[PDB]
Amino acid sequence: FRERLKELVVPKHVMDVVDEELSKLGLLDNHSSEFNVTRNYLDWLTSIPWGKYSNENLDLARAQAVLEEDHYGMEDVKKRILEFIAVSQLRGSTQGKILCFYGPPGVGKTSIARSIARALNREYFRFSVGGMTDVAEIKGHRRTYVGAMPGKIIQCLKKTKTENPLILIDEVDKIPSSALLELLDPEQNANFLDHYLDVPVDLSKVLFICTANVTDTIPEPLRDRMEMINVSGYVAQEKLAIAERYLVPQARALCGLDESKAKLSSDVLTLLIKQYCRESGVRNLQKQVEKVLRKSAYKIVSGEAESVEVTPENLQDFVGKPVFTVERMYDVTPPGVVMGLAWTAMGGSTLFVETSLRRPQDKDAKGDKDGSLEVTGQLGEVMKESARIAYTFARAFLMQHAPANDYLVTSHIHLHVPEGATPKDGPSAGCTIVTALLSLAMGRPVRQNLAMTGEVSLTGKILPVGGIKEKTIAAKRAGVTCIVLPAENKKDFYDLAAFITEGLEVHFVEHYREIFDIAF
Amino acid sequence: FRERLKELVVPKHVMDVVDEELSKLGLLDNHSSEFNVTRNYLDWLTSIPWGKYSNENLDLARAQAVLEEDHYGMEDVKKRILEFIAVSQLRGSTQGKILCFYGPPGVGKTSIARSIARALNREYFRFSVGGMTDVAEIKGHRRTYVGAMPGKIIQCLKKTKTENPLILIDEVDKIPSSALLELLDPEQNANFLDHYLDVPVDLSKVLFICTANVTDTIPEPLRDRMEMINVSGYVAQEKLAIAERYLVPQARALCGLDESKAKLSSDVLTLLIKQYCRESGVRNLQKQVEKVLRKSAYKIVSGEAESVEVTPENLQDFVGKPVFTVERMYDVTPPGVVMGLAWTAMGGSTLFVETSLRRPQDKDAKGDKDGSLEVTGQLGEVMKESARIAYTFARAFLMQHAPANDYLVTSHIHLHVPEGATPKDGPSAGCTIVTALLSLAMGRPVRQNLAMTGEVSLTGKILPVGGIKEKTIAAKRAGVTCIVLPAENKKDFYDLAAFITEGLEVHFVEHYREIFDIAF
Amino acid sequence: FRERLKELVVPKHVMDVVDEELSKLGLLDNHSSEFNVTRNYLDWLTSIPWGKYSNENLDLARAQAVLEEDHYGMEDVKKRILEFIAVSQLRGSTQGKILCFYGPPGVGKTSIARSIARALNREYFRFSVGGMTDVAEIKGHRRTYVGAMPGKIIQCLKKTKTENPLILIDEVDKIPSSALLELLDPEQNANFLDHYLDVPVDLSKVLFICTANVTDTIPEPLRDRMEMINVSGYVAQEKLAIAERYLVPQARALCGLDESKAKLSSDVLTLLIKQYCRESGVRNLQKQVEKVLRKSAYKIVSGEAESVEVTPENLQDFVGKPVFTVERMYDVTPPGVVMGLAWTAMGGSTLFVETSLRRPQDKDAKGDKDGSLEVTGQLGEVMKESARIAYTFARAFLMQHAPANDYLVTSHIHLHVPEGATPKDGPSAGCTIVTALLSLAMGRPVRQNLAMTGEVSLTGKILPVGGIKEKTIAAKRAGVTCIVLPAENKKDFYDLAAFITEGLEVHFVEHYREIFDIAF
Ligand SMILES: Nc1ncnc2c1ncn2[C@@H]1O[C@H](COP(=O)(O)OP(=O)(O)O)[C@@H](O)[C@H]1O
Ligand SMILES: Nc1ncnc2c1ncn2[C@@H]1O[C@H](COP(=O)(O)OP(=O)(O)O)[C@@H](O)[C@H]1O
Ligand SMILES: Nc1ncnc2c1ncn2[C@@H]1O[C@H](COP(=O)(O)OP(=O)(O)O)[C@@H](O)[C@H]1O
């Protein structure tokens, strides 16, 4: 091509390489593998827009409106993109900074990235690195191998044709970390130089967005040079608002109907949200709404009616009987059972820690006859030592609260902590395990709707934990009233919306004597 | 021919390159290493259509009539396809979805794919991805390679000559998966970019069907993309209906016979179903049918008989003595063996959990040594943990129901849980294990036809399980008369057809105390 | 082409190679794979410098100014570079010594490297051999590869184009090590012998600089040729000075502001340091400062205000509630817990060891019945043996100091050493373990703000430890006043800056009896 190279602002290096390329095309003859190689290399080097970028949209109020009018919530993503706009304005050129959205699945991480692109007026392009093993798919490979293609980044640059295409590397925590590093690095950016080509490409001003469900698996070489932002799950009422304003409209558009035919009530949407779904995003809720509208469309095209109104009285005919008929596993907990607030890789959960005697306690202690503890729940070494520490503090606390009670000392116990949480949050069930052992020993059940979370140590101190937002959302959607937290987490509980702290009686504690007071 | 491309309807983007390569092809004479094959590079694209989307019928009445004519049951698939047609008619265009049918072997998935194709009037094309590893076949190679094969999707487009051919991938749970992803991903769908053709195709209109036996093997990036529909097994009377109405006609028209030439009886068909087959599908049933029919054919053509008619008494002259005389391993179960339903990759099943004693009891054991338990059955870690939990609960439940009994606490037992259940349905034999240990310890057997299933917790809560339809079918076909289910599975049992749940006596349950009260 | 060599010194050795290869190219015909391959090999052979040296600055005062004016502290590195320039001067040219910086992350182990490249007027280059595993990325491939590119230093010479480039090997802990030796070995520095270049490549002039968090996981063969220099962390005052001189200006410039619009007061900077960061470097502080500055930029551009002055009473707006609202775990320690002063891979850190008495005292029953010690903290074998040594010594010391006390000898204890230290510094908690055991046994706490370290042997001899600078910095950060050290560490405690050793009363000891007399 001639105008392709003409209209762009290309550097002397690529000018030299394309000059030698034209020369080689002038030295070879038709019908030759060499000429095919040279011509494909030429078209590759010619298809990239150098110095050609897209004029971004920098009105603060217009960006705010674009962001807010097609996504509920996500206030911190909105704030961050607004700060990005403001810095790119106070500077001259474009910025091109790296981000990472982490949170449960189905909360809006990819759609918010599309909307960020639509607000920046930049082009868009995405790809995943969950099912990726070859460095080739990122950095290409030389023109010598038979099947030659340039590693999806030059493929991008072609497919989008602009200097700052807002890439989206989905699912970076489930991965070729070498090429990923070489791509996400302010100092290793300005020249990339994939294997296929031999010219270095200048991608310093493209803003990469990444996604992940959990930070703790993004390799630290990346995690260091990548700014983390949380996109948390929703409570029933935010799920309802999301539903009414975005889920049902575009489902109707997808199934070809309109509002004057298929009407979903707020009552049936809450019935869906509370009975037919359990996640903390809106993925399965959207599946159910699509099912409702498909069966509506059928009952219309057939002719069973001309307009369908879905109300809790006739819901079953569209989807069926409710799948989640209970709120928790236990309504009123027996003695050795306590409710904790696990932080999983899909949001939160209210997991039940259960203890039970394992061998008859009929023994007058003729001699030493120590007790023991058996533990299950696929525990690692960190969690096994946490359970030992919690066992020992339980012994030592019942040693002084009621010395006559030799249950925990001379008795064989089986403890079960279910397998939800992530290894970082694993040893956050310390106070739950302590309460479970103590309730089994005393023969008294815990307070009824009481969920707790926090780390415990031999001396009894309650150390802080993470994931307070997700744990609180899970306690909320599991029907919890009281909630015990480490008094060093009073920050990230009093910054949640008043939606999530409606009727939660929260107790911020420093030592386990306080948890023992409240829980009894 | 230029006539063909000219006839095609507006692939203008492709036509640019089509000219830029075809004028060069025709520019160079034959006897040219490049031209010989660049004629193929033209013929392929010329054969691949671009604008023709074959007529699709949107008649709900006729589509229902054709669906219910050549496939018994499968009303889930039939409802889904009817909703599909209704939606594709409400939208003025064809749409194209991505559906995946899962179920045991021999339930009709491929055959109903054929029926769907001929019912929507779309073309048809199937292929397998069972043991394929290379991406050379799902996406094709490039010209640099010595071979020349444009994959399978381009092959389909050529063979059918339409852009909505309803491709059918088989054994998708046995796959290399990146290409399947890029194929069935509506994000990466609108453009495909095979290797042998650098031109994109609009697959956003074909109706992808996948068939899998077990959904769990389907990698997650696909499992969340395809819509998973279940096709269940077949009770005996449904098997008989299928054989009478479809299998015997197919085998006849396979061996050139007629209703007067060679006839099979309903009584001999039931006899065959019950004695010569054990599966949940109808594959072995059709194999027996076609063997009987080809034996009949040999007899007739040799003239050893005329007007051959198969009866229960001359059936042994065709297939010999039965294969499965006995219903199941036991009819009267001794102490320590109970019948548990399982959900294997082959569908439902009925297995027997067995317990035995390993070391003699008689011992005035000084020191009060602790009883043990050796679990065999080729278990995973999850099943080992779950058997520990069931063991502890059995000991604890006996400790308070029969305080004098010390069988479980101090004795060395061996538990064999037979190995059929999928890794997901592993810890579903929990209540059968508890019952086996308890019946061994109490010396008494459980009541006769008392299959059961459900997860058990450390304090006894019976937790819901999956695969209820398959398990109910396999309890039906084993002489089971009382099945014991977790209470939260009513929404799964009370929606089975009237003939499936016909003779059963079902006890839904929430805590093991009641399973104990209805087993002893 | 030749015009490169037309003015460039090349060795008589490689000259025969290049001329023989030009001949063996001139005999063969173009439009050939072998033509392109030999051409590429020659282009690599010629793309590298062979005699040209950067006219390195040798003005001692110039290099000293260049250093001093872009880094606070690092006296050791700056002195070493000044002496290196001195020897470079007194010789004709220099040899490019090997060097290694070690210390906590975020202290400047890279920016000082680039400043050194500046003051030597060489260029810069870097690469990390942490994440890699194969020696390919360093040693390149032979001529007989499918299609290859050379080792890393070849790309370095291509993108630097002088014989002494000052490259930087990074993350030398996470490592092939033999290859890095053959690279960093004087006798064979002058001979690389990349399989991609048959001629020996000299490297006897480039100075390599490596980086590390800890010098113990660097393999000894490499460590023999590396001259170790330490770059420690900082204290509150040093962090404040770096933030005022470097961090705030660099961030403001990055954001596109000026001095008058956005300013951060000394109070708010010490607030950020002491409150929103718990590191030893300034890595997180950089993020916490440019976050403030981009929120400032938002307020400015978006018209919220035309000037901003971030102050201690409006910082919570810019960042949020304080993150770290506790200097340490216990303000006043119970009996049985002592501060630890460990030296983790991330830098110094104060740790608390606890003891609990996991089992009742038994009321001086007649039996001999020795006590025990369960230990948690994810130890190694050396640490478990050091714990047993501390246990024995504590029992013995209590025997000969309060012979009437039976606690340690007949009692079952639970010790927990937190899992923070390094493997080599593990047995630097012996005196903390002894203090904790004796504190629990006697039944009374230790001096309030007292931290200790040092190894202990059976006879109670305190043995010297390492990491005194980092332990002292940590002890300062955690608000410790009294610090107890081995008497053989006054060499490296008294060479410490007056910043660090100011507020601390420091007790050097030789035996444990003095630690006792101090702690009680
Ligand atoms: N706050 C929200 N506003 C509007 N739509 C939302 C919101 N949160 C989730 N959704 C919808 O939920 C669906 C989840 O898909 P997606 O966000 O792509 O999954 P993931 O978050 O794993 O990328 C999207 O279709 C999106 O439209
Ligand atoms: N419900 C049914 N109605 C009619 N034919 C059936 C039915 N179920 C199974 N078949 C017969 O079984 C065979 C289909 O087996 P197939 O579905 O290919 O096995 P798989 O289930 O492993 O894909 C066909 O001959 C089909 O006619
Ligand atoms: N002593 C110092 N003098 C000046 N700036 C410093 C100093 N220490 C750290 N910095 C700044 O902090 C950042 C440190 O990051 P970096 O040095 O790359 O981490 P590492 O030390 O692990 O290589 C740099 O931006 C640097 O400007």
- Least Cα separation, residue C93 to chain A (angstroms): 30
Alpha carbon distance B436, C151 (integer Å): 66
Alpha carbon distance A247, A266 (integer Å): 13
CA dihedral A211, A216, A221, A224 (to 10 degrees): 80
Q: What is the resolution of this structure in A?
A: 3.5
Name the nearest CA neighbour of C63 among C93, C95, C85. Answer: C85
* Token reading at B31: 């006897």
User: Are A435 and A398 in contact, with CB atoms under 8 Å apart?
Assistant: no
User: Which residues are registered as beta bridge partners of A351?
Assistant: A340
- Least Cα separation, residue C82 to chain A (angstroms): 27
Alpha carbon distance B219, B240 (integer Å): 36
User: Are A456 and A512 in contact, with CB atoms under 8 Å apart?
Assistant: yes
Q: Where are the beta strands (DSSP E) in B310-368?
A: 337-344, 347-357
- Count Cα atoms within 13 angstroms, Cβ side, for A472: 27
Chains C and B touch (3+ CB pairs under 8 A): no
Count of helix runs (H) and strand runs (E) in chain C:
19, 18
Give backbone dihedrals phi and psi of B295, rounded to 5 degrees, phi first: -65, -45
* Token reading at A372: 């023991």
Alpha carbon distance C22, C39 (integer Å): 9
- Ligand 2: which residue has its CA nearest to atom 22? B105
CA dihedral C425, C430, C432, C433 (to 10 degrees): 120
Alpha carbon distance B86, B96 (integer Å): 12
CATH numbers and ranges of domains, chain A: 60-230 (3.40.50.300), 236-310 (1.10.8.60), 337-519 (3.30.230.10)
* Token reading at B262: 């060679």
Burial of B346 (0-12, 13-18, 19+ CB in 10 A): buried
A110 touches chain C (CB under 8 A): no
Alpha carbon distance B15, B45 (integer Å): 10
* Token reading at B183: 């194929």
Residue C271's SS3 state is helix
Nearest chain B residue to A377 by CA: give it.
B385
Catalytic site residue A471?
Answer: yes
User: Are A210 and A228 in contact, with CB atoms under 8 Å apart?
Assistant: no
Name the nearest CA neighbour of B203 among B166, B160, B159, B169. Answer: B166
DSSP secondary structure string, C279-336? -SSSHHHHHHHHHHHHHHHHHHHTTS-S-EEE-TTTHHHHS-S-S---SSS-SS--TT
Give backbone dihedrals phi and psi of A502, rounded to 5 degrees, phi first: -65, -65
Test the B interface: residue of A376, A379, A433 with most B CBs within 10 Å = A376
Using alpha carbons only, what angle is made at residue A206 by residues A201 and A208, rounded to the nearest 5 degrees? 115
- Count Cα atoms within 13 angstroms, Cβ side, for B274: 16
Alpha carbon distance C264, C273 (integer Å): 13
DSSP secondary structure string, B403-443? TT--TTTSSEEEEE--S-B-STTGGG-HHHHHHHHHHHHHT
- Count Cα atoms within 13 angstroms, Cβ side, for A322: 18
- DSSP H or E run through A64: helix A60-68
Neighbouring CB atoms inside 10 A of B137's CB total 17
A457 touches chain C (CB under 8 A): yes
DSSP secondary structure string, C447-484? PTTEEE--EE-TT-BEE--S-HHHHHHHHHHTT--EEE
Q: b/e per residue, A271-300, with b = 16+ CB within 10 A?
A: bbbbbbbebbbbebbbebbbbbbbbbbbbb
* Token reading at B125: 């094309």
Residue C206 gets which letter from DSSP? P
Count of helix runs (H) and strand runs (E) in chain B:
19, 15
Point out the catalytic residue in the list C139, C205, C471, C476.
C471
User: Which of chain C's residues have a Cβ under 8 Å away from the Cβ of A403?
Assistant: 360
Neighbours of chain B (3+ CB pairs under 8 A): A
DSSP secondary structure string, B36-84? HHHHHHHHHHHHS-SS--------HHHHHHHHTTS--S-HHHHHHHHHH
Name the nearest CA neighbour of C288 among C308, C260, C316. Answer: C316
- Ligand 2: which residue has its CA nearest to atom 11? B108
Q: Where are the beta strands (DSSP E) in C360-456?
A: 372-376, 412-416, 450-452, 455-456
Using alpha carbons only, what angle is made at residue A141 by residues A138 and A146, rounded to the nearest 5 degrees? 130
Q: Residues preceding discontinuities in chain C at C–N > 2.5 Å?
A: 175
Name the nearest CA neighbour of C211 among C181, C167, C252. Answer: C167
Name the nearest CA neighbour of C41 among C23, C59, C21. Answer: C21
Neighbours of chain C (3+ CB pairs under 8 A): A
Alpha carbon distance B410, B396 (integer Å): 13
Angstrom distances, CA of residue A95 to CA of A203, A347, C2 = 11, 33, 42
Name the nearest CA neighbour of C286 among C326, C234, C214. Answer: C234
Residue A373's SS3 state is strand
* Token reading at A428: 């956050």
* CA atoms A318, A322, A324, A328: torsion sign: positive
- Residue count of chain A, please give it: 520
Residue C399 gets which letter from DSSP? H
Name the residue facing A414 among B142, B409, B458 (closest C-beta): B458
Name the nearest CA neighbour of B289 among B349, B233, B229, B248. Answer: B248
* Token reading at A244: 């009414």
Angstrom distances, CA of residue B169 to CA of B113, C79, C92, C162 = 10, 70, 73, 58
User: Which of chain A's residues have a Cβ under 8 Å away from the Cβ of C359?
Assistant: 370, 395, 409
* Token reading at B314: 């001359």
User: Which residues are registered as beta bridge partners of B338?
Assistant: B353
Test the A interface: residue of B192, B223, B392, B462 with most A CBs within 10 Å = B392
User: Which of chain C's residues have a Cβ under 8 Å away from the Cβ of A368?
Assistant: 369
User: Which residues are registered as beta bridge partners of B125?
Assistant: B167
Alpha carbon distance C53, C60 (integer Å): 19
Using alpha carbons only, what angle is made at residue C197 by residues C191 and C201, rounded to the nearest 5 degrees? 25
Alpha carbon distance A185, A198 (integer Å): 20
Alpha carbon distance B368, A410 (integer Å): 14
User: Are B460 and B390 in contact, with CB atoms under 8 Å apart?
Assistant: no
Alpha carbon distance C339, C327 (integer Å): 13
* Token reading at A175: 């991965």
User: Are B400 and A335 in contact, with CB atoms under 8 Å apart?
Assistant: no
Alpha carbon distance C377, C296 (integer Å): 44
Instruction: Sheet containing B412-416: give its strands across.
Output: B337-344, B347-357, B412-416, B372-376
C275 touches chain A (CB under 8 A): no
Name the nearest CA neighbour of B28 among B17, B44, B13, B42. Answer: B42
Who's near B242: CB < 8 A, 6+ residues apart? B72, B234, B282
CA dihedral A445, A448, A454, A458 (to 10 degrees): -20
Taking each helix axis from N to C end, the angle separating A75-90 and A109-120, rounded to the nearest 10 degrees, works out to 30
Alpha carbon distance A181, A179 (integer Å): 5
Residue B235's SS3 state is coil
- Residue count of chain B, please give it: 520
Q: Does B242 contact ligand 2 (Cβ within 6 A)?
A: yes
Taking each helix axis from N to C end, the angle separating A381-401 and A430-442, rounded to the nearest 10 degrees, works out to 40
* Token reading at A242: 């999301």
Tokens 């690599």 belong to: C44
* Token reading at B156: 């389909």
Strands B262-263 and B372-376: unpaired
User: Are A413 and A422 in contact, with CB atoms under 8 Å apart?
Assistant: no
Alpha carbon distance C160, C53 (integer Å): 11
Give backbone dihedrals phi and psi of C8, rounded to 5 degrees, phi first: -120, 130
User: Which residues are registered as beta bridge partners of C168?
Assistant: C126, C209
Alpha carbon distance B344, A243 (integer Å): 38
Strands A209-212 and A99-102: parallel
Tokens 């919530």 belong to: A73
